[PDB]
Design a protein around this nucleic acid. Structure first.
Length: 235
RNA sequence: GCUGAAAGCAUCUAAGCACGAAACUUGCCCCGAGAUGAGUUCUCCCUGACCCUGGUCCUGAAGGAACGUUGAAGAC
């Protein structure tokens, strides 16, 4: 359900989709072929993965005019990628896949540019720094909200407005060496037990060293500085 | 970081020294010997008889406790 059919809506959505000709594009949903039909002409190669056999066949006979694609169904939960291929990966809209496809795109792949259509709640929640999954997400990639998708766009019109989000990778840090410490850092931070990670000298002087005014509103860069101070204090 | 071989160079170290993190312990203030590992110092008081060899008598110290007038001490 919830498919976008109007070609005007498809064009207006693709207005924010920045895919180039020399990119292979992988997937997470073909739908009724409204978007993959334009996708096969925009980019070089398309990997159409669909969990519905009908939908696979309707994409096939909708795309018989093109040979620059291939279709392959490996439950997204188990599918895998060309660790040695540069690929903008475009995908679709899932149920919730709780850091399930998120891990597939930030932890189980080297995807350089990712586009999602999500529910406005997940657009605003997962952005906030009060959730740990956000912290492991911001560990090496960045998010930008390109646009908000109206709810009537889809065909069993949903109840909640959607939004378009963009993922790009900016890593180089706890790589593999202080990762187990970064994980040790995050869960103790989000669960708010300070004594396990700081005494009181450190807990107070780190905030002023990081320029912290209120603990109820935190940005990312000063959290990074706080983690650097933690590493300095704990060798 | 200085010197220096091990190991004809070299090097903060193997011999030594000098530093050094809004980090640690002290340096500031308070509780604290039920710390059963129960600590230390100063001062004061008790120097009878009998039978028996467990029974009586005489003696009541230093201090504490209780009552009253009460507190800028306090729910009791």
């Amino acid at each position: 359900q919830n498919f976008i059919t109007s070609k005007h809506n498809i064009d207006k959505i693709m207005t924010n989709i920045r895919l180039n000709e020399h990119d292979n594009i992988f997937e997470i949903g073909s739908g009724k072929g409204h978007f993959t039909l334009e996708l096969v002409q925009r980019c070089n190669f398309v990997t159409a993965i669909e969990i519905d056999h009908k939908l696979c066949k309707t994409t096939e006979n909708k795309l018989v005019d093109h040979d620059n694609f291939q279709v392959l169904n490996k439950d997204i939960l188990q599918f895998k990628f060309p660790k040695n291929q540069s690929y903008k990966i475009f995908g679709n809209i899932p149920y919730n896949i709780s850091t399930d496809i998120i891990r597939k795109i930030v932890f189980d792949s080297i995807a350089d540019e990712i586009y999602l259509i999500v529910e406005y709640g997940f657009a605003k929640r997962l952005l906030n720094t009060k959730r740990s999954l956000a912290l492991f997400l911001m560990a090496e990639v960045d998010i930008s909200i390109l646009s908000m998708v109206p709810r009537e766009y889809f065909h069993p019109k949903p109840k909640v407005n959607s939004s378009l989000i963009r993922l790009n990778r900016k890593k180089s840090r706890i790589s593999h060496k202080d990762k187990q410490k970064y994980n040790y850092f995050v869960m103790k931070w989000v669960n708010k037990e300070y004594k396990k990670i700081f005494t009181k000298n450190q807990f107070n002087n780190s905030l002023k060293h990081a320029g912290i005014d209120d603990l109820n509103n935190i940005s990312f860069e000063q959290f990074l500085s706080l983690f650097n101070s933690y590493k300095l204090f704990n060798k």
